[PDB]
Amino acid sequence: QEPGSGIGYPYDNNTLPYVAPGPTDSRAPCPALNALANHGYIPHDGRAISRETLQNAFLNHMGIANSVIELALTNAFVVCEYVTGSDCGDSLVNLTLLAEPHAFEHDHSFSRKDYKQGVANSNDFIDNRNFDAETFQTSLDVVAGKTHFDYADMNEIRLQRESLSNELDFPGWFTESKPIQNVESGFIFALVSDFNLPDNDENPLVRIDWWKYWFTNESFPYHLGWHPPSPAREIEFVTSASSAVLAASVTSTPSSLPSGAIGPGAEAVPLSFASTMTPFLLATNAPYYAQDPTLGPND
Numbered sequence: 001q002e003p004g005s006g007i008g009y010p011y012d013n014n015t016l017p018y019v020a021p022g023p024t025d026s027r028a029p030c031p032a033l034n035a036l037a038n039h040g041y042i043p044h045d046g047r048a049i050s051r052e053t054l055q056n057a058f059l060n061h062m063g064i065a066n067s068v069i070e071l072a073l074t075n076a077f078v079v080c081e082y083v084t085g086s087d088c089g090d091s092l093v094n095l096t097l098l099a100e101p102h103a104f105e106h107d108h109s110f111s112r113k114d115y116k117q118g119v120a121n122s123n124d125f126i127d128n129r130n131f132d133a134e135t136f137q138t139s140l141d142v143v144a145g146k147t148h149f150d151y152a153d154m155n156e157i158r159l160q161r162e163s164l165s166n167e168l169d170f171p172g173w174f175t176e177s178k179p180i181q182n183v184e185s186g187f188i189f190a191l192v193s194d195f196n197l198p199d200n201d202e203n204p205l206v207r208i209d210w211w212k213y214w215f216t217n218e219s220f221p222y223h224l225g226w227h228p229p230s231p232a233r234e235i236e237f238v239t240s241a242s243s244a245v246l247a248a249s250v251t252s253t254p255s256s257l258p259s260g261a262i263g264p265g266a267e268a269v270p271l272s273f274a275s276t277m278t279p280f281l282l283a284t285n286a287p288y289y290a291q292d293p294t295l296g297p298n299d
């Protein structure tokens with residue numbers, strides 16, 4: 001928000017306004033990075049981003065401690081080297097390259113289509129990067145009529161998304177990514193679980209309106225009473241939440257789940273790519289921004 005607005009106070013004492021991305025700006029397949037870039041906490045153009053810039057942006061403006069993004073930074077730069085063909089040092093070339101498929105970006109996302117989702121031909125690919133309202137609605141509908149959801153509900157959401165993706169993706173494309181997705185499940189609990197409930201740290205419940213605002217608008221749900229978690233969330237909270245989602249009892253089993261969908265997941269680890277492997281082409285679509293309504297500087 002505008003720095004004088006005081007909207008972030010006393011949690012964020014140095015806010016910057018929302019500015020929609022323009023057609024030449026680089027955006028990510030990540031709703032967090034996109035929100036940060038829309039506020040200029042990382043470059044508004046989404047280019048040439050250092051680790052420290054990301055660390056400070058997350059810590060000071062989202063209540064996410066450095067520990068939470070350690071592996072994410074490692075993988076961002078692994079993917080940068082893979083996509084660009086050379087070491088990216090400590091300047092991430094852009095956000096868009098993070099949508100390189102079957103890498104850090106993965107199938108069965110909560111709010112993005114898959115790279116080969118619903119394509120008639122094997123060489124076809126689509127926008128697996130920008131927010132997709134229809135896709136996100138398939139996640140939201142699992143918790144329809146609710147204001148909050150818990151670990152078991154999140155497990156049901158990711159199963160629905162796995163089922164849909166496995167059915168809709170071009171044959172042979174779908175690849176399960178439980179470890180990375182469920183770190184992201186933990187990220188959702190970390191950012192938009194309801195800290196106004198007495199047992200939030202032990203038993204976090206996601207506020208659906210907060211989640212929907214963050215994902216749809218790629219800005220922060222301050223108007224809904226959200227604020228950055230304080231103290232900043234740490235990695236322990238995230239991986240615990242991740243394990244709790246995958247441990248939760250499934251009471252509704254979708255059909256067409258991949259092998260081993262139900263049950264614990266492997267620890268997320270550093271990515272690696274063969275030098276022989278050429279990257280998949282990146283979707284080239286202009287960056288998504290909310291248009292129904294468009295957002296003001298304080299939104």
Ligand code: HEM
Nearest residue numbers: 029030032069072076098104105106109110111112184187
């Ligand atoms: C340097 C830090 C980060 C990097 C490089 C990064 C990168 C990514 C990438 C590549 C994806 C796409 C995966 C996919 O859904 O196919 C993604 C998704 C996601 N990210 Fe980030 N991320 C970072 C930090 C965070 C943080 C701190 C949060 C929240 C606290 C966050 C929230 C999410 C969520 C919820 C998704 C899933 C979106 C969906 O499934 O529709 N990210 N991120």
Ligand SMILES: *[C@@H]1O[C@H](CO)[C@@H](O[C@@H]2O[C@H](CO)[C@@H](O[C@@H]3O[C@H](CO)[C@@H](O)[C@H](O)[C@@H]3O)[C@H](O)[C@H]2NC(C)=O)[C@H](O)[C@H]1NC(C)=O
Nearest residue numbers: 024025026027083084093094095096097279280281282283
């Ligand atoms: C974010 O950065 C990535 C990585 O640099 C950009 O993707 C790459 O964009 C270049 C064009 O600047 C593409 O190069 C072109 O490739 C074709 C086919 O190989 C070739 O015939 C052309 O002469 C040219 O070299 C490159 O393919 C592409 N990389 C991938 C894997 O898709 C991306 O455009 C950047 N996005 C933004 C919004 O800044």
Ligand SMILES: *[C@@H]1O[C@H](CO)[C@@H](O[C@@H]2O[C@H](CO)[C@@H](O)[C@H](O)[C@H]2NC(C)=O)[C@H](O)[C@H]1NC(C)=O
Nearest residue numbers: 209212213214216217223224290293295296299
């Ligand atoms: C995206 O952001 C807009 C702007 O903040 C949301 O629309 C507003 O919602 C706030 C409460 O968060 C209300 O005070 C305003 O009356 C609304 N204004 C307008 C112009 O509609 C919108 O709800 C957000 N989208 C989602 C899905 O959360």
Ligand SMILES: *[C@H]1O[C@H](CO)[C@@H](O)[C@H](O)[C@@H]1O[C@H]1O[C@H](CO)[C@@H](O)[C@H](O)[C@@H]1O
Nearest residue numbers: 023024125126127282283284285286287
């Ligand atoms: C991205 O741009 C490429 C050319 O630069 C196209 O070949 C791709 O199909 C893809 O096009 C999509 O996004 C662009 C924005 O660059 C739109 O102009 C197209 O209409 C399309 O949606």
Ligand SMILES: *[C@@H]1O[C@H](CO)[C@@H](O)[C@H](O)[C@H]1NC(C)=O
Nearest residue numbers: 009010011012013014060230
């Ligand atoms: C914001 O400023 C107030 C008043 O000076 C202060 O009490 C608070 O600690 C500040 N918040 C942060 C996160 O620095």
Ligand SMILES: *[C@H]1O[C@H](CO)[C@@H](O)[C@H](O)[C@@H]1O
Nearest residue numbers: 235236237238239240267
């Ligand atoms: C989440 O899981 C990690 C291991 O992946 C632990 O280090 C952390 O304490 C939490 O249980």
Ligand SMILES: *[C@H]1O[C@H](CO)[C@@H](O)[C@H](O)[C@@H]1O
Nearest residue numbers: 201202203204237240241
């Ligand atoms: C790890 O931490 C999470 C979040 O604090 C808990 O919900 C979980 O039960 C475990 O203690």
Ligand SMILES: *[C@H]1O[C@H](CO)[C@@H](O)[C@H](O)[C@@H]1O
Nearest residue numbers: 239240241242243244247
């Ligand atoms: C990972 O951690 C979660 C949260 O404590 C457990 O519920 C799960 O069984 C696994 O050990």
Ligand SMILES: *[C@H]1O[C@H](CO)[C@@H](O)[C@H](O)[C@@H]1O
Nearest residue numbers: 150152153156250251252
């Ligand atoms: C069985 O119960 C779980 C508990 O959350 C739900 O997520 C599911 O929809 C089904 O009703």
Ligand SMILES: *[C@H]1O[C@H](CO)[C@@H](O)[C@H](O)[C@@H]1O
Nearest residue numbers: 249250251252253254262
């Ligand atoms: C749906 O079915 C699966 C496998 O049959 C169970 O693991 C799940 O608990 C739910 O009943």
Ligand SMILES: *[C@H]1O[C@H](CO)[C@@H](O)[C@H](O)[C@@H]1O
Nearest residue numbers: 142156160252253254255
């Ligand atoms: C229980 O929930 C799962 C996941 O949302 C569905 O696949 C199933 O149809 C039932 O409603």
Ligand SMILES: *[C@H]1O[C@H](CO)[C@@H](O)[C@H](O)[C@@H]1O
Nearest residue numbers: 179182183242265266268
């Ligand atoms: C979230 O984190 C837990 C604990 O490391 C994993 O088991 C899960 O697969 C996801 O990566």
Ligand SMILES: *[C@H]1O[C@H](CO)[C@@H](O)[C@H](O)[C@@H]1O
Nearest residue numbers: 270271272273274275276
């Ligand atoms: C990480 O691992 C891959 C193999 O999966 C190697 O090709 C790469 O060079 C790095 O060691």
Ligand SMILES: *[C@H]1O[C@H](CO)[C@@H](O)[C@H](O)[C@@H]1O
Nearest residue numbers: 276277278279280281282
């Ligand atoms: C990268 O590009 C090579 C050819 O240069 C392909 O063979 C490969 O499948 C990938 O698309």
Ligand SMILES: *[C@H]1O[C@H](CO)[C@@H](O)[C@H](O)[C@@H]1O
Nearest residue numbers: 290291293294295296297
């Ligand atoms: C979002 O932006 C548009 C202009 O692009 C306005 O018409 C709207 O009222 C809101 O400010």
Ligand SMILES: [Mn+2]
Nearest residue numbers: 105106107109
């Ligand atoms: Mn994805």
